[PDB]
């Protein structure tokens, strides 16, 4: 509708980091009784804005989607307004479409959050019902205990978030990790986005370069930005908007010159390595001109060849830092030999013309006239992380970066752009092997599987094999449960345990919402998100912020760290009752009343005297951070690691990593690695050999992840009622499809469905499907293939397309117009 209730001048104001992407944009949450409002005069409302007359452009970001009315546990009603902080350095008052919806996605009884989990849910053999928390713990802890006593920890499976922000963060990763690893001590654990306990960044870390090694200010200071496997307007909006674009526009030139009096700073340029022409390519060309953008539209999976050709060329031209290499690196001469690739071979493999390869090197590595190498920030994400051999691509890319001294200089960095926020503090993983968890589950292993803060039915690789197996195993438990009548909780535990000896699996989901996991889950436990709890996390430049609690969770929904404590204390109590003092002792250390307690126990204990082994993004100075100190810091927080604290200075942190040439390896040097080109994996190549289309996949600007909130939003559902597939118009004509037709996409791995979205910029025999979605799951057609560390090539699959027919309704209501701005 057509009006908004303004926040009163004296309204309560708390800090809130965005729930969603890595950028970690700062917001303020205004909270006030429903029957009060602000006046239009700027000094009579909390915004300080003059609503007596039209506001100019950029004065505010404020829509009805940024407002709500919450009903608290006391039954009292409060207006809320969730709006970007103008003085936050991250976003400077910018809000993406995703963060802009936070108010709407706060829990209310009648709004978009109406189907929030509010109590334990139990599938009692043949129907969903509520149950109590104590019954849920008796069943869940009971099973875990039984499994520990009979099978050991290897019978207990998890797939759990390791990330930051909403459904993650330092309190939550500690809580879950302490439970899984210190208490239960299970190695049968995967991560939300990948099917083993591993890293996205094995190669770069082992080369001595952690993947978040710079500041967002570095994107302002760069001569050149590379965006490799990365659609940052859509996936990291406000980093792109607030930092990248001002550089491309010339707004940061005078700051470069002030820092470096004796260095030329040409107009900044941008290079995209992406098989696909994305909105980010289009918008870059709009802002900077076609002459300052290079789209290296590589063949899918050919990143390694690209970087080996560039590395070879910059070495042959001598566009490298030989003093840097000599003082601070190891293995260069070996990498020159193993990685040798001519520009002609590079061009044949990539499909990129030799002139474009040479130009990219010239922009990026050839000394400027003043003598200094260009400041080239190399930013990468899932196009290579989920690319053709995660480990080898990073090896090849980092070799280029290290040889060109593009780490440790301002305006440089070889960095992840990131996904979620970060907020990792955990004990070490208690196994000595990587385990492909999905494969284990498919093969019939484990008694109990918990999805915690994730939904692999929508997001696993080879997701169809996964769903099939889980549904069937779930059904066996359902069938066994239904023969019970009048059983105690203990008897039920035995019935379910027995069913798991005959192929069954007990499935638990700890979540905000039922999700598609409800098709298989036997138990669902209600969690709480930021604003319903305090939560700490850091963004892509390691900036740690506290998100303040300002409202109650729905019903008995709890902070994930506190659910973990609940589980630990239930297990402890069972062991104490069973007279097993040693097993009880493993479940000590969860005497937690609030999320802060998890912060004190994890983040703040890392590297302290008498602490156990803790792997924390805070490092050993994490104890200097407190909730009260973060509050005083505001949405600016501090860049980790913290270097000092006092009352007069606040938290003082770290802008850029590796500025003195000391890397995270045994000898302090960065290590070059061999990067062989072996083509595509045979599993993926077999799909490519049999089927017509490359089934690229990934993000839409407007849709967040598995659409857990978005599925309930009427605007989102009207815009994207179904997952879409970008198709070349000529391919469309060949298949007799147009916008709003439905197609089956299929291969040897699976079958799924999408609505057709003709896109002129898509190449013939290539496609692009929205990933993770609630209607048409893309991942059914991804292969089982992973690299050496069990990293999937999610961006590597091929399949055929078959027309189902025309969805008239989609044609009447959905725009199929171009999403590439020109």
């Amino acid at each position: 509708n057509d009006r908004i209730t303004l926040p009163p001048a004296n309204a309560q104001r708390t800090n809130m980091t965005c729930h969603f992407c890595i950028v970690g944009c700062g917001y303020h949450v205004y909270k006030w009784p429903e029957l009060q409002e602000g006046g239009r005069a700027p000094e009579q409302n909390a915004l300080g804005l003059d609503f007596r007359k039209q506001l100019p452009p950029l004065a505010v970001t404020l829509t009805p989607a940024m407002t709500n009315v919450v009903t608290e546990h006391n039954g009292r009603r409060y207006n809320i307004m969730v709006v970007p902080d103008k003085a936050c350095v991250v976003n400077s008052g910018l809000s993406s479409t995703r963060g802009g919806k936070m108010a709407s996605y706060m829990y209310t009884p009648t709004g978009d959050g109406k189907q929030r989990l509010k109590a334990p849910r139990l599938y009692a053999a043949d129907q969903w019902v509520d149950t109590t928390w104590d019954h849920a713990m008796a069943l869940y802890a009971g099973l875990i205990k039984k499994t520990l006593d009979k099978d050991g920890p290897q019978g207990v499976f998890f797939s759990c978030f390791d990330h930051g922000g909403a459904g993650g963060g330092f309190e939550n990763t500690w809580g879950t990790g302490k439970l899984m690893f210190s208490a239960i001590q299970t190695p049968m654990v995967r991560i939300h986005n990948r099917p083993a306990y591993n890293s996205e960044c094995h190669a770069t870390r082992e080369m001595g370069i952690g993947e978040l090694n710079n500041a967002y200010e570095d994107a302002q200071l760069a001569d050149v930005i590379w965006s490799i496997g990365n659609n940052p307007y859509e996936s990291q909006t406000n980093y792109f908007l607030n930092h990248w674009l001002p550089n491309l526009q010339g707004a940061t030139t005078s700051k470069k010159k002030e820092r470096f009096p004796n260095e030329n700073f040409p107009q900044a340029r941008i290079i995209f390595v992406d098989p696909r022409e994305t909105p980010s390519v289009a918008i870059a060309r709009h802002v900077a001109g076609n002459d300052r953008v290079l789209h290296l539209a590589i063949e899918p999976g050919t990143d390694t060849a690209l970087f080996n050709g560039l590395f070879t060329y910059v070495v042959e031209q001598g566009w490298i830092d030989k003093p840097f290499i000599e003082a601070h690196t190891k293995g260069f001469d070996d990498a020159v030999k193993t990685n040798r690739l001519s520009l002609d071979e590079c061009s044949n493999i990539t499909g990129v013309p030799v002139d474009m390869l040479k130009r990219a090197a010239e922009w990026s590595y050839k000394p400027k006239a003043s003598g200094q190498a260009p400041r080239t920030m190399h930013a990468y994400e899932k196009g290579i992380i989920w690319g053709n051999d995660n480990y080898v691509i990073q090896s090849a890319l980092l070799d280029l970066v290290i040889a060109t001294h593009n780490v440790g200089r301002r305006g440089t960095g070889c960095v992840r752009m990131g996904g979620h926020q970060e907020g990792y503090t955990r004990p070490p993983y208690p196994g000595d092997k990587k385990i492909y968890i999905d494969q284990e589950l498919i093969k019939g292993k484990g008694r109990i599987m918990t999805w915690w803060g994730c939904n692999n039915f929508q997001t696993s690789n080879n997701a169809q094999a996964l769903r099939e197996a889980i549904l069937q195993r779930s059904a066996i438990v359902k069938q066994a449960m239904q023969k019970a009548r009048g059983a105690t909780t203990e008897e039920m535990v035995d019935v379910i345990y027995e069913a798991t000896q005959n192929g069954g699996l007990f499935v638990t989901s700890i979540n905000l919402y039922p999700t598609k996991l409800a098709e298989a889950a036997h138990l669902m436990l209600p969690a709480a998100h930021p604003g319903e709890m305090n939560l700490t996390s850091m963004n892509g430049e390691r900036r740690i912020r506290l998100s303040e609690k300002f409202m109650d969770p729905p019903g008995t929904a709890m902070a994930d760290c506190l659910i973990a404590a609940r589980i630990a204390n239930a297990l402890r109590d069972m062991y104490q009752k069973d007279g097993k003092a040693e097993m009880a002792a493993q479940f000590e250390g969860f005497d937690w009343k609030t999320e802060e307690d998890a912060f004190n126990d994890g983040f703040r204990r890392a590297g302290q005297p008498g602490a156990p082994a803790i792997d924390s993004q805070g490092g050993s100075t994490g104890h200097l951070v407190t909730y009260d100190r973060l509050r005083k810091s505001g949405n600016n927080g501090v860049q980790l690691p913290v270097v000092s604290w006092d009352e007069s200075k606040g938290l003082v942190g770290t802008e850029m990593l590796y500025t003195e040439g000391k890397f995270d390896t045994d000898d302090g040097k960065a290590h070059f690695k061999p990067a062989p080109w072996n083509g595509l994996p045979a599993t993926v190549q077999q799909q490519k050999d049999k089927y017509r289309f490359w089934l690229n996949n990934g993000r839409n600007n407007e849709v967040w992840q598995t659409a857990y909130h978005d599925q309930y939003n009427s605007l989102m559902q009207e815009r994207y009622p179904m997952a879409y597939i970008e198709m070349n118009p000529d391919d469309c004509k060949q298949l007799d499809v147009t916008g709003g037709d439905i197609v089956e996409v299929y291969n040897d791995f699976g079958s799924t469905f999408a609505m057709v979205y003709p896109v002129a910029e898509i190449k013939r025999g290539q496609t692009f499907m929205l990933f993770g979605y609630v209607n048409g799951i893309q991942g059914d057609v991804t292969t089982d293939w992973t690299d050496r560390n069990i990293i999937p090539y999610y961006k590597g699959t091929w399949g055929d397309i078959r027309k189902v027919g025309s969805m008239e309704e989609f044609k009447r209501t959905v725009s199929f117009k171009s999403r590439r701005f020109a």
């Binding site: 009006r3 940024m66 709407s104 725009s815 701005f821």
Partner: protein
């Protein structure tokens, strides 16, 4: 008492003066609110006039308020600020962008007797306003 805003009734033009896909500019509901009406040339849900094809919008981007520009070739409104684009053929649906609200529709009465188009209301909240009527 009253639950609704007091919108003015503002004459825009007569429908038959509008040429297909040639935007007309006007202000509604006051001189600080720029709007466009366009004859699309083809009926759309809720279009007015003889061919049910005339639509009208607030042109201020619902992100951060830059005046958008009507593109005749795509029949969209594009924002130069952060690249939001709205579909004039789907009631302001955001095609791609950073807004959380569709482009507000100016509600037109079409009187057959006079051929008049009158702006009588707005569906959606105009950028940078506490209420559509200040």
């Amino acid at each position: 008492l009253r639950t609704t805003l007091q919108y003015p009734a503002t004459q825009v033009s007569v429908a038959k003066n509008l040429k297909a896909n040639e935007p007309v500019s006007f202000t509604y509901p006051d001189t600080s609110s720029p709007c466009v009406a366009v004859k699309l040339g083809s009926p759309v849900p809720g279009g007015v006039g003889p061919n049910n094809d005339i639509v009208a919008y607030s042109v201020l981007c619902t992100h951060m308020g830059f005046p958008t520009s009507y593109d005749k070739s795509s029949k969209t409104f594009k924002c130069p600020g952060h690249f939001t684009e709205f579909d004039a053929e789907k009631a302001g649906q955001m095609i791609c962008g950073q807004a959380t609200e569709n482009l507000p529709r100016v509600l037109l009465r079409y009187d057959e007797a006079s051929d008049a188009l009158t702006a009588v209301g707005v569906d959606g909240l105009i950028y940078g306003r506490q209420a559509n009527v200040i």
